[PDB]
C-alpha cells in the first residue's frame, strides 16, 4: 500500500508519453514521444543494462564480489555505472578515448573506472582483462533468438497500457534491433494493423532499403535481424539535430540527437496520407548534450 522503491534500478522504465504539439508541422496524424531521457541515468540502456545484469544474477553469473566490465561508447556504460553503483558491485569500462570529457566524469561520479584506448580496441581490452581475473564478469544480451529482448517486452507493454491498446505505428531507432523488432513481436500478435518503423543515423545529409551491420570485434560484424520491421527511415545528422533543437525551443524538451532522428521519421509518416488519423508512437532515447 506503500509506493517506495527499494533501490533506483527499480525506478528503470515507466516512462511517459508526451504529446508533440509543434514540431510536427500540421501532421494529420497524432505523434506522441516515449520519454527514454526519464530513466535514472538518462537513456533507454538503462533497460538494457539493468536486465542484462538481473539475468546474471539469476543464472549465478554474479556473486556479492563480481566486477562488472563492459565495453561502451556511450549510454550503456552510464547505464551499467548506475546500476551497479546502486547493487555495490565495481565497474570497470572500456571505451575509445574520443570519448567526451563530460561524460567520462559522469561515468567517474557513479564510482566506474575508464579504461581509456585508442571499437575493437575497447572489445580486445575487455576480452584480455577478463582472463586476468574470474571476478571480471561481461554483461551481455542472453535471449534465445525466438524470444524478444527482455526489455522490449517491459517497453511494449508499456506502449500497449498507456495508449489503451491504439497505438498504430511504432517508430524507435535501430540501435541493437532488439527494441524495435523485440517490440514488433509483442505487439504484432495483438494488433495485426500496427506498423513497426526503424531509424537509422547517417552522415550530415543523405534512401532506399538496406540491411545494417551491428558492432563486433573484427571486420565484418554482423548484420542486425530486422525481420519484424516494416521500414527503415534513415536520417542525416543534420536533420536529426535541426529537429532536436526544434524540440528543445518548441516543446520544452532537451533531448538527444538520436531523438532529433526519430521525430524526424514520425513527422515524416505522419504526413503520409494512408497514415492520416492514426497514432503514432515514437521513442526519444536520449538526453540532450550537444547544447
Not at 581475473?133 to 542472453?142: E, K, S
Amino acid at each position: 500500500s506503500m509506493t517506495i522503491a527499494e533501490n533506483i534500478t527499480q525506478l528503470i522504465g515507466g516512462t511517459p508519453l508526451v504529446r508533440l504539439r509543434r514540431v510536427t508541422d500540421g501532421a494529420a496524424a497524432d505523434v506522441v514521444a516515449k520519454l527514454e531521457s526519464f530513466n535514472p541515468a538518462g537513456s533507454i540502456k538503462d533497460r538494457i543494462g539493468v536486465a542484462m545484469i538481473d539475468a546474471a544474477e539469476k543464472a549465478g553469473l554474479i556473486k556479492p564480489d563480481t566486477i562488472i566490465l563492459e565495453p561502451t561508447s556511450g549510454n550503456t556504460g552510464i547505464a551499467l555505472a548506475m546500476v551497479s553503483a546502486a547493487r555495490g558491485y565495481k565497474c570497470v569500462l572500456t571505451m575509445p578515448d574520443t570519448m567526451s570529457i563530460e561524460r567520462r566524469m559522469l561515468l567517474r561520479a557513479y564510482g566506474a573506472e575508464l579504461v581509456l584506448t585508442p571499437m575493437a580496441g575497447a572489445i580486445a581490452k575487455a576480452e584480455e582483462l577478463a582472463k586476468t581475473d574470474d571476478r571480471y564478469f561481461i554483461p551481455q544480451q542472453f535471449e534465445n533468438p525466438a524470444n524478444p529482448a527482455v526489455h522490449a517486452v517491459t517497453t511494449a507493454e508499456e506502449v500497449w497500457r498507456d495508449t489503451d491498446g491504439k497505438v498504430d505505428i511504432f517508430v524507435s531507432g535501430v540501435g541493437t534491433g532488439g527494441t524495435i523488432t523485440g517490440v514488433a513481436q509483442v505487439i504484432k500478435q495483438r494488433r495485426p494493423s500496427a506498423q513497426f518503423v526503424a531509424v537509422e543515423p547517417a552522415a550530415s545529409p543523405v534512401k532506399g532499403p538496406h540491411p545494417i551491420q551491428g558492432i563486433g570485434a573484427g571486420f565484418v560484424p554482423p548484420v542486425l535481424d530486422l525481420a519484424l520491421v516494416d521500414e527503415v527511415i534513415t536520417v542525416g545528422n543534420d536533420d536529426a539535430l535541426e529537429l532536436a533543437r526544434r524540440m528543445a525551443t518548441e516543446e520544452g524538451l532537451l533531448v538527444g540527437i538520436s531523438s532529433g532522428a526519430a521525430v524526424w521519421a514520425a513527422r515524416e509518416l505522419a504526413h503520409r496520407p494512408e497514415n492520416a488519423g492514426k497514432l503514432i508512437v515514437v521513442v526519444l532515447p536520449d538526453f540532450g548534450e550537444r547544447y
